[PDB]
Amino acid sequence: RVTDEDIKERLDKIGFRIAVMSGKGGVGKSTVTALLAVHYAKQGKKVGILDADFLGPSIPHLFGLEKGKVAVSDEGLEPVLTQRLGIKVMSIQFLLLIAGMIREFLGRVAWGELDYLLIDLPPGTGDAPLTVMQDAKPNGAVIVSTPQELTAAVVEKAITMAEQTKTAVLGIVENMAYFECPNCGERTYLFGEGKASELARKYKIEFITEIPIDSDLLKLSDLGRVEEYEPDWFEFFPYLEHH
Amino acid sequence: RVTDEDIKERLDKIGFRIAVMSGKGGVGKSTVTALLAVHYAKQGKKVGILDADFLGPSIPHLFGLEKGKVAVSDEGLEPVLTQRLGIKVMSIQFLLLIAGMIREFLGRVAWGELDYLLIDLPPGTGDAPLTVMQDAKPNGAVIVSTPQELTAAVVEKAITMAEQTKTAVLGIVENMAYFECPNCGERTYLFGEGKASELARKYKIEFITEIPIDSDLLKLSDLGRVEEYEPDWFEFFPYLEHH
Numbered sequence A, B: 001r002v003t004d005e006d007i008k009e010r011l012d013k014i015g016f017r018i019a020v021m022s023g024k025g026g027v028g029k030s031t032v033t034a035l036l037a038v039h040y041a042k043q044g045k046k047v048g049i050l051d052a053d054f055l056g057p058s059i060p061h062l063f064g065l066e067k068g069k070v071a072v073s074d075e076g077l078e079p080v081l082t083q084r085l086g087i088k089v090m091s092i093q094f095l096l097l098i099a100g101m102i103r104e105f106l107g108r109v110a111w112g113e114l115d116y117l118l119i120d121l122p123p124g125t126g127d128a129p130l131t132v133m134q135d136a137k138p139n140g141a142v143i144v145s146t147p148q149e150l151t152a153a154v155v156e157k158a159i160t161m162a163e164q165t166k167t168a169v170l171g172i173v174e175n176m177a178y179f180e181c182p183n184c185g186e187r188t189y190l191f192g193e194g195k196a197s198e199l200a201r202k203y204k205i206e207f208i209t210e211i212p213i214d215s216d217l218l219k220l221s222d223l224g225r226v227e228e229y230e231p232d233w234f235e236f237f238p239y240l241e242h243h
């Protein structure tokens, strides 16, 4: 029930729209989304997360936000804040086709003035996650994949999808690429690891990052204490003009 | 088209029907299925795998069977053999509602005389993987799960499912439970690990196994050379009267 000119007034308050996308489920798209939100918050930035992943909404759980409950104000649907860093979150989860659902999330929600809105897309390169790009029209987008995914095929379906809304492909994230023994700091690289950097060099993408399988990230993910995860795999995420 | 009394003549040639099942996707159900097939073959046994996982058929890939071509004989639909150990495989994959598809797989396929038929179910505890239990009515079934999401809930939906066809729950497999540094042989246990043994003791299941995250299993899985995977996580899988 929200006009195309209506969202404009809302997104005008938002410095930069990043979308996070994946070849498929279980590659840690929502976890990365969360870690980028945490990166930005901790740098002093005001951050919003829109959970577009109706399939399996990981986002609220990661911030221990099962206390769903949206409330309505002058400004509209008040997003629930993460207690440690004040990140604003919106998820279907907070109500116990979607073409228009995203239009509401961009319309009726009081995002206020924030520097970055992170959209946790549905998984894959299908129509589902393209419908969301239709309405969110992001400035930037970030590919999340495991080594043993991460083909030029996938990366090209990704660059092509980003064409349909004119969005820059800012980075590849190689999630669960290696493991670092905490005893002896030995790394063991999972088969297919190192492809992110080669494909990035290949298609002229400027940001690569290889996130290991981290027991602590799994612990705190589960506990919903992700805001306390110390390691920043986005230490070197490039600046992005966000006025 | 295959009659209910028709399958009887076929399964009469088959010593024991094991079904492999999961709380959800990406927990390595198909990989375990494959490793149990390999365990049995290498022990001298004649083994069949029915790939009931139409969703995302991992099985043929694991044995490098993209040569997906069935042929028909007197005996019927000839399963394609794995080249190293002679395991017989059947998968929709070999043709480039399913209620009756499984009925064909159990009916029209020439399984011949074999000791074990392993059924790689669809993932989860939903209707999909229950339809297959209807027609396969397995003697035994094995739960595959990762630590994070190995709940009494899941295990009970599993024991309950197995009731509906009177099948024994033979084992729990905790897949990707830990990692062993190849430098210093240190193990690092993923959060939630050790639950399989507690739940098994709890619901009186006789077989537990914890499979680590294995770079080599990932390598050979991908290469489709799984038959050459040396480690047997079923070293101590109990005997099962299979006349």
Ligand SMILES: Nc1ncnc2c1ncn2[C@@H]1O[C@H](COP(=O)(O)OP(=O)(O)O)[C@@H](O)[C@H]1O
Binding pocket: A022, A024, A025, A026, A027, A028, A029, A030, A031, A032, A056, A058, A123, A175, A176, A211, A212, A213, A214, A215, A217, A218, A221, A222, B148
């Ligand atoms: N680097 C990592 N180390 C350990 N666990 C991880 C890592 N990345 C993701 N996970 C876990 O893997 C699972 C899948 O991540 P998730 O974000 O749900 O993927 P997706 O967004 O594709 O569904 C979750 O349990 C998540 O916390």
Ligand SMILES: Nc1ncnc2c1ncn2[C@@H]1O[C@H](COP(=O)(O)OP(=O)(O)O)[C@@H](O)[C@H]1O
Binding pocket: A148, B022, B024, B025, B026, B027, B028, B029, B030, B031, B032, B056, B058, B123, B175, B176, B211, B212, B213, B214, B215, B217, B218, B221, B222
């Ligand atoms: N213990 C393990 N170590 C490393 N990789 C594994 C392990 N178990 C499974 N995998 C890999 O994880 C992925 C998921 O396994 P799969 O059997 O396809 O899950 P499911 O059958 O439940 O969909 C595959 O790439 C598989 O080879």
Ligand SMILES: [Co+2]
Binding pocket: A181, A182, A183, A184, A185, A186, B181, B182, B183, B184, B185, B186
């Ligand atoms: Co070590």
